[PDB]
Amino acid sequence: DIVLNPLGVPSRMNIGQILETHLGMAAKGIGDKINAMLKQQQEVAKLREF
Amino acid sequence: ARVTVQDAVEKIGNRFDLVLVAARRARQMQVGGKDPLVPEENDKTTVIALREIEEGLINNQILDVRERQEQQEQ
Amino acid sequence: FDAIKIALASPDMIRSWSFGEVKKPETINYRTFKPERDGLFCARIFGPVKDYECLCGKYKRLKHRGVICEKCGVEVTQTKVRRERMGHIELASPTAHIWFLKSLPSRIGLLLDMPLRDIERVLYFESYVVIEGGMTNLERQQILTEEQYLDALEEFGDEFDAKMGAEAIQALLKSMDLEQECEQLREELNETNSETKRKKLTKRIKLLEAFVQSGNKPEWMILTVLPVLPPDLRPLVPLDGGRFATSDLNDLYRRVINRNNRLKRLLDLAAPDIIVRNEKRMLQEAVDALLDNGRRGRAITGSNKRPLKSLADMIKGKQGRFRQNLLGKRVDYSGRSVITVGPYLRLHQCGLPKKMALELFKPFIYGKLELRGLATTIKAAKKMVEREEAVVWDILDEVIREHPVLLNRAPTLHRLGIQAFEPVLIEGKAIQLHPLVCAAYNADFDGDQMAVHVPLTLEAQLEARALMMSTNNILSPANGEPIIVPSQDVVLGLYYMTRDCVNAKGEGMVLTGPKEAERLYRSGLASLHARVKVRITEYEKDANGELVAKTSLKDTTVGRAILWMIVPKGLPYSIVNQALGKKAISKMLNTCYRILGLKPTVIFADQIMYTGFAYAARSGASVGIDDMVIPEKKHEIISEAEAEVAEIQEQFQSGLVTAGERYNKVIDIWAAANDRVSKAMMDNLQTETVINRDGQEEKQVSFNSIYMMADSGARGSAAQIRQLAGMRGLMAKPDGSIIETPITANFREGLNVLQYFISTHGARKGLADTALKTANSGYLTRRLVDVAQDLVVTEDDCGTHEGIMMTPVIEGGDVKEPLRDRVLGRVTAEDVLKPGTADILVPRNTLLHEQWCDLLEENSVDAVKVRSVVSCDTDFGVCAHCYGRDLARGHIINKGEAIGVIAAQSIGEPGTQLTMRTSSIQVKNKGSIKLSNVKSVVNSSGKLVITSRNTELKLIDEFGRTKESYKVPYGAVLAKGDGEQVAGGETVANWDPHTMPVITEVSGFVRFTDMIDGQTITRQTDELTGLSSLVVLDSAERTAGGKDLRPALKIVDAQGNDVLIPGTDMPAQYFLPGKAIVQLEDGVQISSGDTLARIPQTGGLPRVADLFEARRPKEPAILAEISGIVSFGKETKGKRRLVITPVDGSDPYEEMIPKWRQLNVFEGERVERGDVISDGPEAPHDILRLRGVHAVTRYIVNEVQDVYRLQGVKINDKHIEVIVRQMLRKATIVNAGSSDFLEGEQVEYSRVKIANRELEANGKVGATYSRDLLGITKASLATESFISAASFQETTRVLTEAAVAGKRDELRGLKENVIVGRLIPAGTGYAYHQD
Amino acid sequence: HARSTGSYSLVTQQPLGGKAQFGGQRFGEMEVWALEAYGAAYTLQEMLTVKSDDVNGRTKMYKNIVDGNHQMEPGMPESFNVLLKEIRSLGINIELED
Amino acid sequence: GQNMRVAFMPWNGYNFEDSILVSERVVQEDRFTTIHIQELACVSRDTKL
DNA sequence: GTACGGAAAAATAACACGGCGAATACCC
DNA sequence: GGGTATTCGCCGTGAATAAAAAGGGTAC
RNA sequence: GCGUCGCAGGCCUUUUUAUU
RNA sequence: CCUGCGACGC
Ligand SMILES: [Mg+2]
Ligand SMILES: [Zn+2]
Ligand SMILES: [Zn+2]
């Protein structure tokens, strides 16, 4: 959706945006796994243990 | 089009009288309606005057003797 | 028109200005909008309220023009005459003007020779004054009290006259002859020996001559008739509710008119004196509040608790008529929008929105629609534009193709902030800016806005195309460096493309050209970093203009061959075969502009930006958590550092070292640990590669994105990588000290709360410094512009021989600028001779380009005398030979360029990068020393001592030039002589600090003369067995019986006779100053060099602001004004007496020195004019009045460049010399012979030069002058032009002096032509003024 | 924001300020210094007289641009006349001599 | 605010100094559309005549 | 609800630096 | 009592623009 | 291609926020 | 005096 420039990361020292990027990618991966489990007909026990 | 004007600066002495000579040449085409020497290609009188400076067909002495011949004609 | 003339206004002139008299205080009715009969808003005085209609009626027509009605008497004319007609107020009592009374120095107090307090008591009805008492005890001007007037009345009833108020001041100013008083003041000035009395007498004589030469009268200061403002300049605006709100000037005029009417009504009824005195006092206070509210007393406030605006508040200040309505105005045909980036644009064009271009080009589209015939009526063309039809966009595209626009940012620090571009019609509401001009504009794309402007005339379009085009401004006029340097993305793409690795796809194949390299890269058969063999065809123009081609097989990569298609023919291949960083591309563009020219350089920069933006996207560089690696040896270095801190703390706990040494050792070991961490991190980040060529590993340069972005110079430096990967290190405090506990973590791992709270101090300090520097920077830039606005190049060669000597500056550590960076682009004053033979190497009037610099650098030349701006003999301007080059083009400076404005904009621009918050020498290399200005004597041990005050220690290498320069004190010894050389790295000079010894020149018997115990010397026994010495008592706390008893050590021989010094006939005695501890008792044979007596002891932007203002330091270094022998005198319990006795002439000199300051000068020495007495910062006035103009010029230039060199700022020396020349423009007359000048007045330098030249041409004697130095504020006010002095600062006193002097002000400059609105004498306006 | 022509003030005949009043941009002192640093004398004279102050000058300039002529008359700014009338009201005689 | 898929790479100089490249699907989904409400008054006062 | 606009309480308020001129105190 | 010569007041100065409110006469 | 009639507008000071 | 609006004459 958005293409940013990595040139401002060594000069302006804000490394927390890259950690927020990685953590949001992991959170979206967990959310897409939950959505892929909910899109197909799955039971309650496997979803609960996941 | 005229991106750089270095060939116009190389003809006359400095860059300040270039503006006055090109303005005196450009006012003859828009107000007086005089036909230019260089064939125009979708250009205004500023670019035509700068090209006439660049080709060497227009300077201060040429405009002076042309105004003198116009005063002697009429 | 001609020059501007300002003088005093007679009451007849005020009555001639007026058209009527205002008598009622009311302005206008509240229920009816019609004006009053006779008021501040009138119809029969100032003019009608509507166009060609009267007030009563029946004359609202056009045939009746200028007629006078019989009902109300209103002239039927236009409404435009209402903003120019004035009125007058006939005051019943005279009033004093507050400008000629309260503005120091007082014009009434200096003319009447009276203090200001007595005139304030007389004017405000608090004291009496006698006027022409006659044959009485009272004099002509005496200050009487309330009771003394009654005593003088009851004692001398007849032949007496005493008045109180402004009538007494008017009678004193009226009954006074100027010529007789001026002649009496001259005859009193001839019999004058005092200093300050002479100053006051010359000031009063100059004021009297100013009143005599001007046509004004001294009694015109007392106001009799008071003029008013036109009503359109102070209107009554309507409100929505219906109530008409009043202004400040209308309220003050209403108050003055009401008080004058009350005074007239009270004077009609014959009131006693007590009430009418208070009424006249209230009228005086009302007039003073109307003229200047705030000077005398308290400023009156109405309904807002704020001081009201007077007639003087609209002229001075930031909201005055000069700085808000004349120097800076709001213009038409302009816009403003947020800027964006356009990658597809060229260097000469920009992206303009259609919605802004349709509005900014309305009458051009109207004229084209009326010419084409699509709209005959202008309303039809307006409706066609407002409807936005199809042909309207075609007309707009037709009228925009070759019509430039002026793009401008909000902070305009220099001339590159307003550049011209060609508009490209884009869709949107943002302006597309070229990426290459962002370095010149200093504007990124995080929310910045820029303003656009549209030229209309042909001259303005030609000035935008020829002078203000972005393709014409590629070199900065401050230093000559380019401004089209590539930014981070372009250098990142050109760094990634031009690299190599030891093993890739397609390595080791022979290529026939760059087209095959591009084909193999775009086909996917060869990598971008692969060592191949490409057959290139490079051209070289080493012949007479023509280009020669050659063909050979090069060992290069694939990406460099692709970039070789961008490089033109004239450039060689050795500039592209390496890894392109940032300075490599900068010197590539420099070489292209140097060899080829200007026209291919624009296309080269555009194609470089295009290929950089194309090849930065194909890489895919990105930051991550794995790119910032952690050194594996960081934890063990932190462990050894903590173990060393624990060992130092355990050593401190036992009591072996102090707290300061413990803190210093902790700071040093933590700095060593931080350096080891940074070294290990840089060693881990350099290679980071184990790649196989065929089967075995091989190290290479890392392809990490952080290292590639930090090594190529795109963004970030080594300190950023140290703070991101290694430890942050030591951090400072707000108090200034350094915390002993550093930050042992980085931004990659988790910081704690304390390490963040420590760094918040430095972050807040940097933010506050950045926020508070900008006002001082803008003030300094404004002062430099207003002090250097009238320096235009007017000639070519004045024919002078003066000039400064250019030498490379040496401080003691290393050199900073060589001779080439200081001599390039300057015309020499004298012929530079060869060091071997006295033949002429280069003529004088030669512009030294790079070839002359290369010819001078090989002949070992250090001193080149060049022509300077301050040493030019051109009246009212400079010439083209004393300035040098243009610093933006290759030719000489043209005739008509404003060199002062570019100098002030070059100095004032990097002010935002400065700061605002507050025993032995060692040589560097091997070379022979050069000892200059040294007087020595050979001792018995073989050393070399110094018997002089100042001594220059310079180092001369084998080439014959000066590389180093040191300074040695008075008492010191040298390890080696002047003949032998230094091997390098050893101590040459060594001396003990905090001591001031005395060294003798002869060796003999020492005797004690005038030394008695108990009075002038104290024999104390120290508790240690080593120290048993004699102390000489100071001459302040001694008794009264020994004031003239001064000790001295006479040196005799063993036979008792007095030996003499070879060269003179004085004894070799050495007196003892106060607090001088001698060694022991006399009776020992000393050597030549012995130790006899023991005498113990803001930088950045405020530094430049104090240097340019010629400010005196807090502790100035006192110098010797006249040469001769130093001698001390009898002190008067305060400052210490000193006197310099010459050798041939008399002694008209006596000065005092404060006794608390340290003086490194003994009793009897030999000093000259220029030597110092104490140690400290010097003042430029003493350097000007003692050494000369060139010495203080070099001092100011070096002191400014030493501040500007610490921050890495490159500013040429001629821009400082412009301000140095503008600082010294006046002169002080010493002996005026056959001239119209006075004795001690200040005139201009060019005026006294013209006067002396005319007196020499007429065969008469000239005048002797002395040049004085003034600051950037004082030189802007002490100018012959009163308009430029009033518009800058202090409008009230400048207008007061121009009124009492009667100054006639010719324009002759830029700022005066800005105010009146005509062509300035610079650029095309200079040629217009010449034609 | 963009503007060719519009409303003017009463005391000083200058364009207004602000987007809501349809005003124009301000050509401050630093822009005047940057224009003086060039050789652009006609552009500064057009910015100071025709585009800002001179009523007759700006009407003749509008009629010349509509007719098709790029020529201006300098004239006299109204703010200088306001300054002369305000200094002259303080009892000081200042006038242009010829 | 909103959270979207992001990438850190140069794209043809369209993220040159601080610029941001936004896709068209962010505009089509209308996830950054804001509503702004103004106020226009009409005061009817009592006056003469 | 029309009409003089001032000065004394106000339970007022209160910057750092620099240059120039006047009151005044040292020194014979 | 003349000539200095430190003190102490006082005035002038302190960057550049866009939006959004609030108030334009209070007393006896 | 202009002129006549009617309507609306041209401000000042202070405070706050934001940007460069 | 200048802008914008509505109307009318030759
Ligand atoms: Mg920004
Ligand atoms: Zn009438
Ligand atoms: Zn010269």
Which of B14, B25, B31, B45 best tests the C interface by mutation, with the highest count of C CBs <10 A? B14
Query: How far, in Å, from the CA of E14 to the mean position of ligand 1?
Result: 17
Helix then strand then coil, in percent of chain C rounded to 5, is 35, 15, 50
Q: Is C438 annotated as a binding residue?
A: no
Half-sphere exposure of A34 toward its Cβ, with a 13 Å CA cutoff? Answer: 9
| Cα(C297)–Cα(C126) distance, integer angstroms | 15
Specify if D9 maps to a domain: no
Q: Angle at the Cα of C442 (from C440 to C445), degrees rounded to 5?
A: 120
From start to end of C368-417, where are the E strands?
Answer: 405-409
CB B55 within 8 A of CB B40: no
Enclosing domain of residue D67 = 14-98
CATH number for the domain spanning B59: value is 3.90.940.10
Tell me, in Å, how far CA of C1074 is from C1' of G8? 34
CA angle C636–C639–C643, rounded 5-degree value:
145
Give the distance (Å) from ligand 1 centre to CA of residue C448: 5
| E25:A1 CB<8 A | yes
Order of strands across the sheet that contains C162-163: C143-144, C128-130, C162-163
Ligand 3 centroid to residue C124 C-alpha, Å: 58
Say if B1 falls within a structural domain: no
- The alpha carbon dihedral of C661, C664, C670, C673 has a sign of negative
**What is the CA angle C255-C261-C265, rounded to 5?**
145
- List C330's β-bridge partners, or say none: D26
E13 phi-psi bin (left φ>0, alpha ψ -120 to 50, beta other): left
Q: What are phi and psi of C49, to 5 degrees?
A: -90, -20
- Closest ligand by atom to C793 CA: 3
Place of tokens 């401002």: A8
C389: amino acid identity, one letter: E
Nearest nucleotide, C1' to the C-alpha of D56? I2
Say which of B23, B42, B43 has its CB closest to residue C462.
B23
Count other Cβ atoms within 10 Å, centred on residue C103.
19
Q: Which of E12, E16, E20, E47 to probe by mutation at the C interface, max C CB count within 10 Å?
A: E16
Backbone angles phi, psi at A33, to 5 degrees: -70, -40
Give the distance from residue E33's alpha carbon to the nearest chain A alpha carbon, in angstroms. Answer: 16
Place of tokens 């000081």: D92
Quick one: which of C340, C319, C260 has its CA closest to C90?
Answer: C260
| Tokens of residue C239, six digits | 């409100």
Across-strand partners of C553?
Answer: C535
Q: Which ligand is the nearest neighbour of the Cα of C441?
A: 1
What tokens were used for C338?
């947020």
Contact assignment for D69 to B31 by CB distance below 8 Å: yes
For residue C1069, which phi and psi values (nearest 5 degrees)?
Answer: -105, 145
C56: annotated binding-site residue?
A: yes
Using a CB-CB distance cutoff of 8 angstroms, which residues of chain E are in contact with residue A3? 6-7, 9, 11, 14-15, 20-21
Task: Tell me whether residue D1 is in a domain.
Answer: no
Contact criterion met (CB < 8 Å) for C617 and E45: no
Closest CA to C559 of C614, C633, C596: C614
Half-sphere exposure of C1030 (CA within 13 A, CB side): 18
What is the gyration radius of the CA atoms in chain B, in angstroms? 12
Q: C-alpha angle C1301/C1307/C1313, rounded to 5°?
A: 135
CB within 8 A of E1, min separation 6: which ones?
Answer: none
What total number of domains does chain B contain? 1
Checking each nucleotide's C1' against the CA of D9, the nearest proves to be H10
Mutant choice from C487, C623, C704 vs A, greatest count of A C-beta within 10 A? C623
Question: Which residue from D39, D42, D69 is facing B15, i.e. has the nearest CB?
Answer: D39
Structure tokens at D74: 């300098």
Closest CA to C1081 of C1035, C1033, C1034, C1017: C1017
| C897: nearest Cα among D44, B18, D37, B11 | D37
CA of C779 to C1' of F15 (A): 19
Q: Do E21 and A3 touch (CB under 8 A)?
A: yes
Distance C235 CA to H7 C1' (A): 22
Bridge partners of D94, per DSSP, are C6
Tell me the sheet residues that pair with C878.
C793
Q: Give the residue carrying structure tokens 């869709």.
A: C427
Note down the domain range covering B35: 6-73
Nearest to C562 by CA among C617, C521, C610: C521
- Backbone phi and psi for residue C854, each to the nearest 5 degrees, phi listed first: -70, -30
Residue found by looking up tokens 């009629």 in the block? D63
Selection from C852, C850, C4, C904 nearest residue C412 by Cα: C904
Scanning every strand, the nucleotide with its C1' closest to C323's CA turns out to be: G16
Ligand in closest contact with the CA of C796: 3
Q: Which two tokens stand for residue C283?
A: 């009228």
Distance CA C1291, CA C1307 (A): 18
* Residue C1040 Cβ under 7 A from any strand G atom: no
Name the domain count of chain D: 1
Resolution of the experimentally solved model in angstroms: 3.0
Which nucleotide comes closest to C51 if you measure CA to C1'? I1
Spatial distance from the CA of C1114 to the C1' of F17 (Å) = 13
Residues 301-360 of C, Cβ under 7 A from nucleic strand F: none
Please give the span between the terminal C-alpha atoms of chain A, in angstroms, as a whole number: 29
Measure, in angstroms, how far nucleotide F9 C1' is from residue C504 CA.
93
Provide CB contacts within 8 A for C1037, sequence distance 6+: none
- CA dist C893 to B6, C881, C899, C1308, D89, Å? 16, 8, 9, 21, 46
Residue-wise over C605-627: b if at least 16 C-beta within 10 A, else e?
bbebbbbbbebbbebebebeeeb
The SS3 of residue A22 is helix
Separation CA C314–CA C964 (nearest Å): 59
**Does residue B39 have a cis bond before it (omega within 30 degrees)?**
no
Number of neighbouring beta carbons within 10 Å of residue C752: 9
Nearby residues of C251 by Cβ (< 8 Å), 6 or more positions away: C302, C308
Transcribe chain E into DSSP letters. Answer: -----EEE---TTTTSSS--EE-SHHHHTTTT-----------------
D65 touches strand I (CB under 7 A): no
Pick the CATH number of C633-764 from 1.25.40.10, 1.10.132.30, 1.10.287.1080, 3.20.20.70: 1.10.132.30
User: Could you tell me the distance, in angstroms and rounded to a whole number, from the CA of residue C358 to the centre of ligand 1?
Assistant: 28
